[PDB]
Amino acid sequence: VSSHGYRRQTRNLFSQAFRKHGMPNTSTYLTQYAVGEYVDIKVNPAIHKGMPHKYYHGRTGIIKEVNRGSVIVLFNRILANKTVERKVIVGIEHIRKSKCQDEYLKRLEINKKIIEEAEKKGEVPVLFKRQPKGPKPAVEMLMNNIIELSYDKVES
């Protein structure tokens, strides 16, 4: 039978990668955080204070409050077939800034131009949506340089 301590089953998780042992780099400590940013959790096994519980490893959430050397992040979780919000305390050594909003922020920068012109000249924005890839395109071909294919390889 299995046990139920705070760091159960973390032999693979919570171990350093090959040729990457030691303390964190300066960039870790010089990064500034703000309320409302999206942030991503990855535990550093060498630091023993401010570690989250291993369920949260590799998950992304939103910063709710900022303190001297730690952050409070909001998560959601299913328990007993219902949704529950959870507020997780994490030290700054175990977090990295998330990339999940990157494309959306670029798209907002384009929208922000159009939405002004749409008051002056038009009435409503064109709004620049994405579209999924359509059907295969048409082609005009010169028809020299033909290559033949054959079952010449007998494959003993």
- Residue 9 labeled ligand binder: yes
User: Per-residue x/- mask for RNA, residues 104 to 133, rule CB under 7 A?
Assistant: x--xx--x---------------xxxxxxx
Residues of this chain, 42-81, that bind RNA according to CB under 7 A: 42, 45-46, 48-55, 57-60, 67-70, 76-77, 79-81
Q: Which is nearer to RNA, 34 or 142 (CB)?
A: 34
- 95 CB contacts (<8 Å, ≥6 apart)? 33, 39, 40, 41, 42, 71
CB-nearer residue toward RNA: 5 or 137: 5
Q: What minimum distance in Å lies between the beta carbon of 134 and RNA?
A: 10
Alpha carbon separation from 53 to 28, 58, 62, 106, 112 (Å, rounded): 21, 11, 17, 34, 40
Interaction of residue 136 with RNA, rule CB under 7 A:
no
| Closest to 43 measured CA to CA, from 67, 14, 23 | 14
Number of residues forming the site for RNA (CB under 7 A)? 73
* Shortest spacing between CB 35 and RNA, in angstroms: 15
- Alpha carbon distance 50, 89 (integer Å): 7
Q: Which residues pair with 71 in a beta bridge?
A: 66, 90
Min. distance of Cβ 48 from RNA in angstroms?
4
Report d(CA 85, CA 79) in Å as an integer: 10
Q: Any residues with CB less than 8 A from the CB of 151 and at least 6 apart, and which?
A: none
Residues 78-97 within binding reach of RNA (CB under 7 A): 79-82, 86-89, 91
Q: Which residues are annotated as a binding site for Mg(2+)?
A: 9
Q: Which residues are annotated as a binding site?
A: 9
